[PDB]
Every structure is written in C-alpha cells, then in structure tokens.
C-alpha cells in the first residue's frame, strides 16, 4: 500500500510514541469486548467474563504484543504487505478458520485505540493513512482464503 509522503511521515511519528506494551492489549482486549464472538477463538485464555477481566488478563496483553508486532512488520514493508503476511494468513485462515470480517474489525479497534491514545494528535489525515494500512493488513490476512 502506497501512502502520500505527508501521511507516511506522520504514521511513523505516531507509531514511535506508541507504548509497545499496552496498545496491543487494548486492541485485542476491546475486540473481545465489543465483538463477543471473538472470545470463542481464545478459550485457552482464562477469565474473559467482564470487560475489566478481559483488559486485566495477562494473556490478552501478552498475545497483543505479537499482534502489534505484526503491524509494525507490515508498517515497515508497506510495499508488499501480502508477502510479510503470507504465512499469517495460512495460520488464521486455512487452519484456524477466522472469518475475514474479524480482520477489518481488529484493524479498526486498533484505529480506535490509537485515537484513544493520541487524542487531537490523531488528526483526520493521520487516520486516513492508518486506515489504508490496517485495510491492507486485513486484505493481506485474508489472502489465503480469497
């Protein structure tokens, strides 16, 4: 995915200020809260009953760092997102059976988290760019099911 250099410059400066220890856990955590059927793919994760229990759960926070890790990986090779995720799509699709919609949702809860985190800094043009990014990770995470 190709983003115009004014945007590209801004999506790296924002990711730089990212707490590479909490945001990932808020994304996946909010996913399991806002869309309850996502909890079904995380049975081996313990207590998920209350939103506080989903947030405070160590496994949510632990998994969330690797998920965020993939986005950083995809943010660096934004020229070929389909390749870097070619293996991720096999694990999630042809094996784990995650419906393609849940990919756009997590990508969008993540967008909501960056907004929660940055406030006014997460301006409309900085969102617009991140959308192209999270849309791209999704369209690349569903590559081996399409």
């Amino acid at each position: 995915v190709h983003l115009t250099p004014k945007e590209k410059s801004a999506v790296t400066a924002l990711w730089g200020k990212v707490n590479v220890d909490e945001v990932g856990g808020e994304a996946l955590g909010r996913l399991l809260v806002v869309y309850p059927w996502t909890q079904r793919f995380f049975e081996s994760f313990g207590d998920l009953s209350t939103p506080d229990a989903v947030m405070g759960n160590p496994k949510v926070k632990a998994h969330g760092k690797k998920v965020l890790g993939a986005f950083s990986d995809g943010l660096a090779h934004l020229d070929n997102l389909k390749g870097t995720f070619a293996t991720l799509s096999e694990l999630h699709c042809d094996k784990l059976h995650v419906d393609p919609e849940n990919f756009r949702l997590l990508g969008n809860v993540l967008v909501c988290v960056l907004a929660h985190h940055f406030g006014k800094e997460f301006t409309p043009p900085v969102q617009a760019a991140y959308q192209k990014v999270v849309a791209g990770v999704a369209n690349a995470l569903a590559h081996k099911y399409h």
Binding site: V33, V34, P51, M55, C112, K120, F122, P124, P125
Partner: protein, 141 residues
C-alpha cells in the same frame, strides 16, 4: 438490541458531548470523507473543504439526530421515521457507509472523550450506532 447497561452508557457518554455536538458531528464526517472518499459521492451539492459551513452545519443535525435517538432509544424506529425515508428510500445509501461513519464517529469520541471511552462504553456505542444504522437503512412504511 440495546441492553439496560447499553442504554444508560450511551446516555452517560453522549451526555458528556453536550455543547460539543456539532463540532464532533463535523469532525466525524470529515474523518469519514478523508478516510473513505467514496462517501463524498453521496454529497455532490456539498462544500467539502476543511472548515466548510455546510459540513459544520450538517454535523449539528447529524449530531442532533443522534441526540434525538438517545432520547427515544427504546423506540428509535418511530423517532427516526422521517430520517429513514430520507436515507433508505430517497438516497438509497449502502449500509456499508453507515459502518464507516459509525467507525469514524467512535474514533472522534475516542479522540475527544478518553475518560468516557471505556471498553464497556465503546461496546455500547457500537451497538447504538449499529441500531440507528439499521433503522435508517430499512424501509418500514
């Protein structure tokens, strides 16, 4: 279908918006137009540059339409009745665009009211917005 917890979380959160209504409704639409350009096609008669008086005016109505919906939340089809004829019958809006504005509306609120945007209130607001989006998109005359 909204829960007793949803109903009040939306009332308590969209309440902290208050006077900030039109400003948010305007930022929401802007965030949508920029992030998703295919939604501009629904507004050809509109002044779409940043700071536009129409967008900022539409934003007050979009935002008041939602406040109206938070008033009669237990009976939204009857309230937004005039609005459904508009978006379902007249405009023929694809429900996907509603998903987009609903998302941008959450992003705006996430950016502005961080103390209100708990996992709980987010969940309740997504459901609320999904509910008005069904009403506006369905033909129930």
């Amino acid at each position: 279908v909204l829960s007793p917890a949803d109903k009040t979380n939306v009332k308590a959160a969209w309440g902290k918006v208050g006077a900030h209504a039109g400003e948010y409704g305007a930022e929401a639409l802007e965030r949508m137009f920029l992030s998703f350009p295919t939604t501009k096609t629904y507004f050809p008669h509109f002044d779409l540059s940043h700071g536009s008086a129409q967008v900022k005016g539409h934003g007050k109505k979009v935002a008041d339409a939602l406040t109206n919906a938070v008033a009669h939340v237990d009976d939204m089809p009857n309230a937004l009745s005039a609005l459904s004829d508009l978006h379902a019958h007249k405009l023929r809006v694809d429900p996907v665009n509603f998903k987009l504005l609903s998302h941008c509306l959450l992003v705006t609120l996430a950016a502005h009211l961080p103390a209100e945007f708990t996992p709980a209130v987010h969940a309740s607001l997504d459901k609320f917005l999904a509910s008005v989006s069904t009403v506006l998109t369905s033909k129930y005359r």
